[PDB]
Design an enzyme around this catalytic site. Structure first.
Site, mmCIF file in Angstrom:
data_model
loop_
_atom_site.group_PDB
_atom_site.id
_atom_site.type_symbol
_atom_site.label_atom_id
_atom_site.label_comp_id
_atom_site.label_asym_id
_atom_site.label_seq_id
_atom_site.Cartn_x
_atom_site.Cartn_y
_atom_site.Cartn_z
ATOM 1 N N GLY A 242 0.777 -1.234 0.000
ATOM 2 C CA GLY A 242 0.000 0.000 0.000
ATOM 3 C C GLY A 242 0.807 1.282 0.000
ATOM 4 N N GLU A 278 4.338 -6.475 0.983
ATOM 5 C CA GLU A 278 3.558 -6.954 -0.190
ATOM 6 C C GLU A 278 3.361 -5.830 -1.198
ATOM 7 O OE1 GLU A 278 -0.082 -8.495 1.698
ATOM 8 O OE2 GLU A 278 0.758 -10.508 1.671
ATOM 9 N N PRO A 279 4.413 -5.104 -1.619
ATOM 10 C CA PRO A 279 4.241 -3.963 -2.516
ATOM 11 C C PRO A 279 3.863 -4.370 -3.948
ATOM 12 C CG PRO A 279 6.560 -4.374 -2.173
ATOM 13 C CD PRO A 279 5.814 -5.318 -1.258
ATOM 14 N N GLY A 280 2.889 -3.652 -4.514
ATOM 15 C CA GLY A 280 2.503 -3.739 -5.936
ATOM 16 C C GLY A 280 2.793 -2.416 -6.627
ATOM 17 N N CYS A 349 -17.514 4.301 -26.785
ATOM 18 C CA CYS A 349 -18.920 4.737 -27.003
ATOM 19 C C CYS A 349 -19.553 5.448 -25.800
ATOM 20 C CB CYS A 349 -19.775 3.486 -27.232
ATOM 21 S SG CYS A 349 -19.669 2.286 -25.855
ATOM 22 N N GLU A 350 -18.834 5.844 -24.753
ATOM 23 C CA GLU A 350 -19.521 6.442 -23.580
ATOM 24 C C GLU A 350 -18.657 7.498 -22.905
ATOM 25 O OE1 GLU A 350 -19.589 2.275 -21.555
ATOM 26 O OE2 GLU A 350 -19.458 3.713 -19.877
HETATM 27 C C1 LIG Z 1 -3.475 -8.019 0.813
HETATM 28 C C2 LIG Z 1 -2.841 -7.070 -0.150
HETATM 29 N N1 LIG Z 1 -1.516 -6.978 -0.143
HETATM 30 C C3 LIG Z 1 -0.888 -6.124 -0.991
HETATM 31 C C4 LIG Z 1 -1.560 -5.343 -1.892
HETATM 32 C C5 LIG Z 1 -0.803 -4.460 -2.843
HETATM 33 O O1 LIG Z 1 -1.111 -3.058 -2.636
HETATM 34 P P1 LIG Z 1 -0.254 -1.918 -3.412
HETATM 35 O O2 LIG Z 1 -0.275 -2.316 -4.895
HETATM 36 O O3 LIG Z 1 1.141 -1.987 -2.775
HETATM 37 O O4 LIG Z 1 -1.034 -0.698 -3.043
HETATM 38 C C6 LIG Z 1 -2.961 -5.422 -1.924
HETATM 39 C C7 LIG Z 1 -3.745 -4.666 -2.891
HETATM 40 N N2 LIG Z 1 -4.957 -4.278 -2.636
HETATM 41 C C8 LIG Z 1 -5.963 -3.650 -3.543
HETATM 42 C C9 LIG Z 1 -5.339 -2.646 -4.497
HETATM 43 C C10 LIG Z 1 -6.345 -2.091 -5.505
HETATM 44 C C11 LIG Z 1 -5.787 -0.951 -6.347
HETATM 45 C C12 LIG Z 1 -6.758 -0.426 -7.409
HETATM 46 N N3 LIG Z 1 -7.011 -1.438 -8.424
HETATM 47 C C13 LIG Z 1 -6.202 0.806 -8.102
HETATM 48 O O5 LIG Z 1 -5.935 1.801 -7.432
HETATM 49 O O6 LIG Z 1 -6.070 0.725 -9.322
HETATM 50 C C14 LIG Z 1 -3.612 -6.331 -1.071
HETATM 51 O O7 LIG Z 1 -4.967 -6.471 -1.095
HETATM 52 C C1 LIG Z 2 -24.530 6.003 -30.635
HETATM 53 C C2 LIG Z 2 -25.092 4.926 -29.765
HETATM 54 N N1 LIG Z 2 -26.161 4.255 -30.202
HETATM 55 C C3 LIG Z 2 -26.688 3.259 -29.478
HETATM 56 C C4 LIG Z 2 -26.237 2.937 -28.230
HETATM 57 C C5 LIG Z 2 -26.890 1.823 -27.466
HETATM 58 O O1 LIG Z 2 -27.453 2.300 -26.211
HETATM 59 P P1 LIG Z 2 -28.400 1.322 -25.333
HETATM 60 O O2 LIG Z 2 -27.627 0.040 -25.062
HETATM 61 O O3 LIG Z 2 -29.638 1.099 -26.197
HETATM 62 O O4 LIG Z 2 -28.711 2.137 -24.123
HETATM 63 C C6 LIG Z 2 -25.156 3.666 -27.712
HETATM 64 C C7 LIG Z 2 -24.604 3.365 -26.392
HETATM 65 N N2 LIG Z 2 -23.782 4.048 -25.703
HETATM 66 C C8 LIG Z 2 -23.119 3.960 -24.367
HETATM 67 C C9 LIG Z 2 -23.724 2.894 -23.480
HETATM 68 C C10 LIG Z 2 -22.947 2.771 -22.197
HETATM 69 C C11 LIG Z 2 -23.592 1.846 -21.185
HETATM 70 C C12 LIG Z 2 -22.701 1.502 -19.988
HETATM 71 N N3 LIG Z 2 -21.517 0.716 -20.418
HETATM 72 C C13 LIG Z 2 -23.508 0.687 -18.977
HETATM 73 O O5 LIG Z 2 -24.561 1.152 -18.560
HETATM 74 O O6 LIG Z 2 -23.114 -0.404 -18.597
HETATM 75 C C14 LIG Z 2 -24.574 4.676 -28.499
HETATM 76 O O7 LIG Z 2 -23.517 5.403 -28.070
#
Ligand SMILES: Cc1ncc(COP(=O)(O)O)c(C[NH2+]CCCC[C@H](N)C(=O)O)c1O
Ligand SMILES: Cc1ncc(COP(=O)(O)O)c(C[NH2+]CCCC[C@H](N)C(=O)O)c1O
Lengths: 422, 411
Positions: A242, A278-280, A349-350
């Site tokens: 962490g 446990e560094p990541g 697309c979003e």
């Molecule tokens: C139990 C345990 N040990 C070590 C770590 C590594 O942590 P770090 O990479 O040194 O900070 C963890 C990690 N825990 C969750 C990290 C989620 C990060 C998130 N996807 C983000 O910020 O992108 C752990 O659980």
């Molecule tokens: C240009 C364009 N046309 C159609 C759609 C389809 O939309 P829907 O599935 O009918 O609502 C889109 C969709 N765009 C972004 C959808 C993001 C949804 C998000 N990942 C989620 O809710 O999980 C579009 O851009």
């Protein structure tokens, strides 16, 4: 400060003395993750120097980055491995990690994965009552004793550490210190299946103040004292991961590995404990840029957009966590390019598909390189194929400035394989 | 209500008359996406009946779900395809979609992908100035004229990366006039958002889109299409909410479209595919953190990120009757992934499940598998559907650890 990616006054970004523009021209015109192999070495060496004189395991958290070449490199320098799944353990063993420097953590470890862990002799954390029952069952199946660490939530002062204290009340992780005796009695009941070797806490991610490590270690040493008094032979304290890094590139001063180990050094040495860390993020995040090409620039009237080839498919952190990662151009902009505010967005697309918001940048021309910094941790590891944006290749730069490919680009054929014969 | 997943009085979850517990026992003990093929058919038929009397294209939004068998089945029932990348276009052609019923949209379409789109003769939207310049270049490279629709934002828009500036309309028209060989302007496009629960906005949008199309026709452009996008919402809460039907959506634009002799393109994703699917899980165990209770399942944010990414509610229930005297209490439903963001749902009143019991996440057909990662090297799940006759067919192979290793072969 000392970043492996440097913008020289010529307006070019460099990695290890090589222009990122030259690297970009040498590979396929699609987004890619670019690493400094030397910065990986420097991050590991900073922990090794911090732990000198302390018996220790540096458990690299593979969940941060599962590039096989990066894992083999860390192993070659004396690293252990922290695992959160059976597949991560299979990859660690393939990369050549010593199973006696491997730690398997998790709140939902499968019986299947625990049988693999028991068979290979890795350290296993205990997260819950159902977890300890599955570990005993995996011991019975494999016929091997399992080396276990109890994962305890240290009861930190909520007036000093409100977020960690609340986190311990709300989170799916760890054992409340009130239930410790249940776990000790269970371990004492299964001497053939269980060897209790230590205690584990993990305090959060992006930690920028080391006082939480000081205060938590004092509480973890009192749990280990109590465990040792009841006749368990405890030789490890795992303080988890962490440590944070600087995402803002604005001169913030972060605690070093030396600062972190200095908070627990004297207590660990006085109790003759092996320290597991446990560094990541603090091993791999700051070694890497997500390298992009500018598709084009547009405005809706209020906001301006730099549209890139890369997206939330490759790099979801900004969207998922509202996280800041620093953005800059690879090459000098045209003379007369206006500096103004841009959202940096992908083709997906979003509106959640953004890499950064409200960034002051020279207006880039079409085809210009752009980087998202500190993209080594929880970036490729969290990538999807959303919009059938297939996963990118990876390269690294070595000490001599030479470029090596360390992962193949995913192809459309790799989508179609899933339907073959169906 | 009219859901393809039904909880019988007997306490068993059913899909198209087949017990979900029976389906789980017949496949590998790992999470999977389970679809009702019949429900896919019903969702399409609702649009097909709403559009009777209107010249129309039902553009299925492939970004919602890219399973090749689901694409082939929609294509076999007369669907068009809406695409946001060249790979989606490749997949749609492989699925046998008619290029004449394909629409390629996006705020960052690549020159490469626009070249493929021009070669295959699909409709292509125009999102920006740089985009129009790229379509012109793709026309020159391929030597094909491109059929284009201007994407307008009819008056989350002062912030949108999508569409042209309405006030620059004349710039786009002058550019189309100035490239007759490369560009044919065939229509106008709006997409208003996702999870739309009130069809008022469709009515208001169509009226503004028709004013635009009238102006474009007066200036001498042969425009045949109004593309009103997607975004019709569905019920995620399963507590009796009444949402506009596709008939309700087409009824607000029908007379306007007929009066102008316009072909109507709609681009449904969610309302074609979301409510056909459960993400099916096994309970690893139940744990307590004092008064707080967790059901830990094998599924995770690796397979199903929407709750975590959008704070979205998807309904959760058990597959099988629980033991008599199982305490009904409040649980977070969480996976094995190493962070707090790995939850499928929070604060759910459920009977305490035994280890190994089935648990479903509902309405998982849209933006679920399509957004799946290999985080924690949780490899992507297999997919199954139930036929009319109640039999089960695999429509996607489970991903394997070998599929990770292949990325490093020869490196
Ligand atoms: C139990 C345990 N040990 C070590 C770590 C590594 O942590 P770090 O990479 O040194 O900070 C963890 C990690 N825990 C969750 C990290 C989620 C990060 C998130 N996807 C983000 O910020 O992108 C752990 O659980
Ligand atoms: C240009 C364009 N046309 C159609 C759609 C389809 O939309 P829907 O599935 O009918 O609502 C889109 C969709 N765009 C972004 C959808 C993001 C949804 C998000 N990942 C989620 O809710 O999980 C579009 O851009």
């Amino acid at each position: 400060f000392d970043h492996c990616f440097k913008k020289s006054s010529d307006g070019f970004l460099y990695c290890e003395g090589t222009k990122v523009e030259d690297i970009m021209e040498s590979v396929e015109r699609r987004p890619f993750y670019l690493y400094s192999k030397p910065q990986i070495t420097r991050n590991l060496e900073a922990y090794k120097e911090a732990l000198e004189g302390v018996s220790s395991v540096i458990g690299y958290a593979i969940k941060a980055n599962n590039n096989l070449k990066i894992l083999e490199h860390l192993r070659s320098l004396g690293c252990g491995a922290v695992l959160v799944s059976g597949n991560e353990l299979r990859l660690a063993l393939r990369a050549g990690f010593d199973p006696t420097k491997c730690i398997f953590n998790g709140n939902g470890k499968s019986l299947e994965d625990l049988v693999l862990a028991a068979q290979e002799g890795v350290f296993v954390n205990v997260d819950s009552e159902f977890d300890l029952n599955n570990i005993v069952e995996a011991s019975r199946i494999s016929g091997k004793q399992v080396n276990v660490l109890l994962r305890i939530n240290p009861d930190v002062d909520p007036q000093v550490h409100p977020y960690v204290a609340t986190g311990n009340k709300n989170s799916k992780f760890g054992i409340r210190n009130e239930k410790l005796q249940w776990f000790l009695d269970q371990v004492k009941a299964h001497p053939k299946e269980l060897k209790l070797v230590g205690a584990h806490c993990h305090l959060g991610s992006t930690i920028t103040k080391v006082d939480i490590f000081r205060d938590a270690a004092v509480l973890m040493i009192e749990y280990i004292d109590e465990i040792r008094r009841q006749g368990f032979e405890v030789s490890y304290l795992n303080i988890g991961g962490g440590l944070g890094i600087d995402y803002y590139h604005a001169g913030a001063v972060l605690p070093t590995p030396m600062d972190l180990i200095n908070t627990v050094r004297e207590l660990v040495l006085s109790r003759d404990l092996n320290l597991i860390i446990e560094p990541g993020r603090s091993l791999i995040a700051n070694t890497c840029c997500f390298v992009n090409h500018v598709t084009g620039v547009k405005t809706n009237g209020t906001k301006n957009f730099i549209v890139i080839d890369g997206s939330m498919a490759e790099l979801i952190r900004p969207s998922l966590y509202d996280a800041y990662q620093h953005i800059e151009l690879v090459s000098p902009p045209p003379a007369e390019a206006e500096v103004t505010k841009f959202d940096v967005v992908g083709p997906v697309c979003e509106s959640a598909d953004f890499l950064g918001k409200d960034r002051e940048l020279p207006t880039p021309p079409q085809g210009a390189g752009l980087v998202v910094h500190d993209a080594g941790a929880y970036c490729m590891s969290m990538a999807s194929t959303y919009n059938l944006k297939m996963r990118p290749p990876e390269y690294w730069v070595e000490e001599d400035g030479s470029i090596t490919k360390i992962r193949h680009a995913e192809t459309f054929d790799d989508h179609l394989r899933f339907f073959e014969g169906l």
